[PDB]
Ligand binder design. Structure first.
Ligand SMILES: [Zn+2]
Ligand SMILES: [Zn+2]
Ligand SMILES: [Zn+2]
Lengths: 263, 46, 114, 89, 65
């Protein structure tokens, strides 16, 4: 469809190995950054503690709670508490969850994210459900209880972005490469005896043609063909991380044309 | 049912006033811990 | 204590606008725009596109200090061509560019098994 | 002789000797309780001394510190002295 | 104290792989490297997270109060 062109290699619920082509390096990057820092997500951002006789400190536990990825599929149908017209938090802008655990058995009792319970009204939007990907539906190991110890908390999920705190980040890592065959000569290989023999040839050298011995340096070639791979953390479907990445970037520029306008 | 103090060891919820020195029931642990607050604390999840 | 709130990176405080347009004096047909609450993500972008325009004589950006979220964009264009327009142009040109990318992707997504 | 010190909330009388930190956080036993968030120059231990009515003896939190009370311990020495150890986290 | 929830460097969820890792070692008699790769921890930033953790909580739980 004339313009930037995707060409997927691998795909699963977690990764999306692909090849962007026919685009400016600047755009590949801005998109690369946006995915890492500005895609909205839901995450625990307030913990009220009724009882903690655990071996850990409240803020210690609270910190982990926020790191627990939550369902953020329909995150757009949720508003930022700062915009919402209520007083603090409400179903229109927040998801409330609870954690009650007691060391009943004499064996060490584990507390997982599965043990979290939504208490607010999700009004039909897939949101706030603690993500689970392990082979036993346990989720993240929040704490451990000895017999007799207790943990009664009250969380409050809210919409956020990585720029504010890395807990709200939907991305895990983002592979990024170009010109696997150092033809644009963007880098100068450090070596002891042989540049070529000492530096491992990358995956993507296969998807390209090695330059020819006698060709004079191509001084007009630019940087197109970027080999990326996005890893989602679960709060959102991989395909989405990318898509919404392009979306937010799009809305950003839009917020600017609208600035010149009402300017 | 309330409890102003706890005991360093038997965990038994003690609670007495002045002239009561500092001992628990059977656990003469002259220690005693001050018991948490009911005024629930909020925490930034950051 | 001295650390500013993190939301101040993307939220315009009070009295601030997303853009402050000022006329450059050193040269003709030159403008300096100040983007508040934005970083390299938009900066290098609008810069790169602005450079694909031939009637554009100058385009560069810079965030003077990492502590604050704002960058400056200076554009110089051919007589008759308003810099403010080149920006609008670069923007739209970008927005379109992405829309296409968005599609192509959602398209290739479906053709995948898993 | 007939002159001690007491761990309790003070409320100015004849001497008024006290300090800028607020005592609102203390309990009537003169000690804050675990869970209470403290900061500024707040008072952690309320104490008083009648030197020949109330002269404020008390421990305010370190000026450049501020956390949450983690544990208050009340004990006795070998001379039967009332002891107090406030740990802030 | 306990398994950090995520990899400090990239964000990968890791707090849900501690017990599995422990089993991969005991009941399956595998080695840490092979064990870690099977849990999907491919980049060293994520590998070090698990391979270097020290579960001191299992010692804290041993105190009575
Ligand atoms: Zn609300
Ligand atoms: Zn006792
Ligand atoms: Zn990592």
């Amino acid at each position: 469809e004339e313009g930037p062109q995707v060409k997927i290699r691998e795909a699963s619920k977690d990764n999306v190995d692909f090849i962007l082509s026919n685009v400016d390096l600047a755009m590949a990057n801005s998109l690369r950054r946006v995915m890492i820092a500005e895609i909205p997500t839901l995450a625990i951002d307030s913990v009220e503690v009724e009882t903690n006789t655990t071996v850990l400190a409240d803020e210690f536990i609270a910190h982990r709670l926020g790191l627990i990825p939550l369902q953020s599929m329909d995150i757009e149908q949720l508003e930022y508490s700062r915009d919402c017209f209520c007083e603090d938090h409400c179903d229109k802008c927040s998801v409330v969850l609870t954690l009650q655990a007691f060391g009943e058995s004499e064996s060490t009792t584990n507390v997982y994210s599965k043990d979290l319970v939504i208490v607010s009204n999700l009004m039909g939007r897939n949101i706030g459900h603690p993500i689970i990907q392990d082979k036993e539906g346990n989720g993240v190991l929040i704490c451990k209880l000895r017999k007799g110890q207790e943990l009664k908390l009250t969380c409050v999920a809210k919409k956020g972005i990585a720029k504010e705190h890395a807990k709200w980040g939907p991305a895990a890592a983002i592979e990024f490469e170009y010109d696997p065959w150092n033809k644009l000569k963007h880098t100068d290989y450090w070596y002891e005896q042989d540049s070529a023999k000492e530096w491992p040839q990358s995956k993507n050298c296969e998807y390209e043609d090695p330059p020819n011995e006698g060709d004079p340096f191509d001084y007009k070639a630019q940087a197109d063909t970027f080999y990326m791979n996005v890893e989602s953390v679960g709060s959102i479907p991989v395909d989405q991380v990318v898509v919404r990445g392009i979306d937010t970037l799009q809305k950003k520029v839009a917020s600017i044309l609208l600035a010149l306008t009402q300017m | 049912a309330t409890l102003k103090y706890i005991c360093a060891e038997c965990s038994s919820k003690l609670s007495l006033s002045r002239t009561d020195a500092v001992r628990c029931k059977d656990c003469g642990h002259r220690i005693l811990l001050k018991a948490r607050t009911k005024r629930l604390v909020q925490f930034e999840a950051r | 204590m001295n650390a500013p709130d993190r939301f101040e990176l993307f939220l315009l405080g009070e009295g601030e606008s997303k853009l402050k347009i000022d006329p450059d004096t050193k040269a003709p047909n030159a403008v300096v725009i100040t983007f508040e609450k934005e970083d390299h993500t938009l900066g290098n972008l609008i810069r790169a596109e602005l450079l694909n325009d031939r009637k554009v004589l100058f385009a560069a950006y810079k965030v003077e200090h990492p502590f604050f979220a704002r960058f400056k964009l200076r554009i110089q264009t051919t007589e008759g061509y308003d810099p403010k327009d080149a920006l609008k142009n670069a923007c739209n040109s970008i927005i379109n560019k992405l829309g296409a990318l968005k599609t192509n992707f959602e398209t290739e997504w479906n053709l995948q098994t898993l | 002789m007939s002159i001690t010190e007491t761990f309790e909330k003070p409320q100015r009388t004849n001497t008024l000797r006290m300090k800028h930190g607020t005592y609102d956080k203390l309990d009537d036993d003169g000690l804050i309780a675990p869970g209470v968030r403290v900061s500024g120059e707040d008072v952690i231990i309320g104490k008083t001394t009648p030197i020949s009515s109330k002269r404020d003896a008390s421990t305010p939190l370190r000026s450049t510190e501020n956390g949450i009370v983690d544990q208050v311990l009340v004990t006795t020495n070998q001379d039967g002295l009332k002891f107090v150890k406030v740990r802030v986290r | 104290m306990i398994v950090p929830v995520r990899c400090f460097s990239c964000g990968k969820v890791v707090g849900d792989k501690w017990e599995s890792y422990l089993n991969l070692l005991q009941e399956d008699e595998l080695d840490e490297g092979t064990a870690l790769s099977r849990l999907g921890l491919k980049r060293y930033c994520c590998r070090r997270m698990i391979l270097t953790h020290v579960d001191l909580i299992e010692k804290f739980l041993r105190y009575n109060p």
